[PDB]
Symmetry: C2
Amino acid sequence: LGDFGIRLLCVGLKHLLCNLKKLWLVSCCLTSACCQDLASVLSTSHSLTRLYVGENALGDSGVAILCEKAKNPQCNLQKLGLVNSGLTSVCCSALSSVLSTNQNLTHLYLRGNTLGDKGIKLLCEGLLHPDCKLQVLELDNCNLTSHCCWDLSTLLTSSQSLRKLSLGNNDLGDLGVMMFCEVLKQQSCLLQNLGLSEMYFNYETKSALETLQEEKPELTVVFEPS
Amino acid sequence: GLVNQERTSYLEKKLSCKISQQIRLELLKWIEVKAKAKKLQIQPSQLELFYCLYEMQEEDFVQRAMDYFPKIEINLSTRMDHMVSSFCIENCHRVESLSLGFLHNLTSSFCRGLFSVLSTSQSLTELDLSDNSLGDPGMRVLCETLQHPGCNIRRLWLGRCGLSHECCFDISLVLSSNQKLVELDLSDNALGDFGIRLLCVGLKHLLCNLKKLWLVSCCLTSACCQDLASVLSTSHSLTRLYVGENALGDSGVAILCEKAKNPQCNLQKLGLVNSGLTSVCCSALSSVLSTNQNLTHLYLRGNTLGDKGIKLLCEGLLHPDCKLQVLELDNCNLTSHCCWDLSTLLTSSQSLRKLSLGNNDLGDLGVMMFCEVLKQQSCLLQNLGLSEMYFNYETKSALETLQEEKPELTVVFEPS
């Protein structure tokens, strides 16, 4: 259902009496060209809350378009599945804007992108905003390095809304993760998974994480690969 | 090999010094990149970088080049693979984890020269020897080296190694002298009841600081529980005991429970997974849950407990002194008739955090009971499970609504 298919689909999605809540457009051969129509759906739709558009070519120019409308505080978007969209740090300032203004957005899935530390810094500007209500942030294979740990560490104790942070298959490092252990103990609200799956560490890091789970039992799980 | 400094004259100096110095740096950078790029590829597969270092037998270079290998995963097919690995690992001061994929070698002293090196490393902490032919005659060699005062290996994985009862004699000797080892994975072997009887000799020994022990799929029967129960009673350090995928039926659990119920027992996680348990032993598990305040995780999936088992477990779980945090009940042959007791559990227990209800017939009307009670300030902050469990629209809608209204309820996690 390429860009044209979406252009047609959006005719129904923007229609009154359309009560669609969940829409999956994953792997539909889409490009940024279709975002112009999806953005209008997000703006006008009274019912659409779950939009999954990953595994497409909705690059930074696509997300910027969706964000232009998703940032609207009256938008009903709750879950945004911008997963394997090939995003870079370029659009993270757009995602940041959405996170800061759209108080209805609770889940954001960015895995498969290549955001790096620059992207994390930009997202944190929004995530750390007092009106950000994001609960679940998924950052698995986002091409992250240990250089982003300072900002993620800040995120873990500064955000009052974040509950889950699915850091995953990236090179976050041992010393990087240890920063989380130290700050999470300081009354972090992250009640849900910390992630770090598919990410391998040394003994000391694993020991600290296991200790963390024992000392802070409300922290559902870190979930190491071994 | 050519790029070295430890050489004499006699035309060994016809190579440029300035080139040798620059190339040494280029080769070092090359190793750093490929050593760190620990991935499947056709480029140097860890060992090949070691072969290169082996030729350049210069400690000043090799010891630096080896600091780019924090985790070493290599396969060993021949004598040189061992000589090369031995040399490089010995000169590595920054290896924290090692995995040795022994191939068509082992049951011999052939690798003795490698194991004698691992035991002298001051950085190696985790050693994984799983899924290779490290049969009893090979394990003996390793166990001789794991007794070294400077061993420093804290985690040892011995999965499908083809070990039998004979190796437990040597493992016991290691446990009785090696004060560093904390995790020992003996799963997927043939360490039958006798093997455990021998193993327990080390586990009950003073100075044995083992914390995690995996005896999963070790061909055990209830006969061995008599010795494991003694370990749980006496051990000051064992907290994680995984004994699932065995024939430790209700007569086995009752034995373990007799000692695990002791309030001074250090058991924290009890992996009685696919043990073929019935409701018969749930009264024993209940006793443990009521008295042992150190037990935080109990894994019962694969059993056939039914609603009778749940009722009996609830008698313990609902006890004011029960500290269980995670209860796993996946394929436990449960029916919707147990929902009343699970519903009580969800709001009455103050300690439970997770409840992994899973692949069973809990029903739609059954699960709806959870939605109604969980909303009433339940402390189940962790997953509710219900995976592989299929419901109708209304139930799914209620669960999705529940997650939105009660955001602290990490995830329910429906199959679709």
